[PDB]
Design a protein around this ligand. Structure first.
Ligand SMILES: O=c1ccn([C@@H]2O[C@H](COP(=O)(O)O)[C@@H](O)[C@H]2O)c(=O)[nH]1
Length: 133
């Protein structure tokens, strides 16, 4: 969870379950599907939420990534493709990444997160679980 209110993503998260696996997509892939969104607007980044667990006396809570359209979210001002720790840029080959996507953020009690799904052919990152699936 968050102790500081996050920017809300339009989509469900993708959660790491195998340690040592890299979060990645093939260039041109990795933008989740949202009805009626034109491919020219399918551009943005996945953002890593590092999660932390509390200490017990038993015996670890791997990261979860969330998608933000280009020009929105916690890295709204950063340039597409720029190395940034915790940021993984993705865009349809139809998209011009010099321009912010035309999509206002999600207002979380006028609209719920869309379950994250990729088009046929999308190479899925092994070691990661798409929430909702
Ligand atoms: O940093 C964020 C941004 C949004 N999500 C929202 O959480 C819900 C699902 O999270 P998940 O467990 O499927 O990752 C969706 O509404 C998603 O947009 C968060 O709660 N944390």
């Amino acid at each position: 969870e968050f102790n500081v209110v996050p920017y809300y993503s339009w989509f469900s998260g993708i959660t790491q379950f195998q340690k040592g696996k890299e979060f990645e997509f093939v260039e041109g892939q990795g933008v989740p599907i949202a009805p009626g969104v034109p491919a020219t607007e399918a551009k943005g980044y996945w953002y890593r939420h590092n999660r932390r667990s509390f200490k017990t006396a038993d015996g670890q809570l791997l990261p979860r990534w969330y998608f933000y359209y280009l020009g929105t979210g916690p890295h709204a001002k950063d340039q597409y493709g720029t190395d940034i720790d915790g940021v993984y840029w993705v865009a349809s080959n139809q998209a011009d990444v010099n321009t912010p996507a035309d999509i206002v953020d999600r207002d979380p009690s006028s609209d719920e997160a869309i379950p994250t799904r990729f088009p046929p052919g999308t190479v899925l990152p092994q070691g990661y679980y798409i929430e909702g699936s």
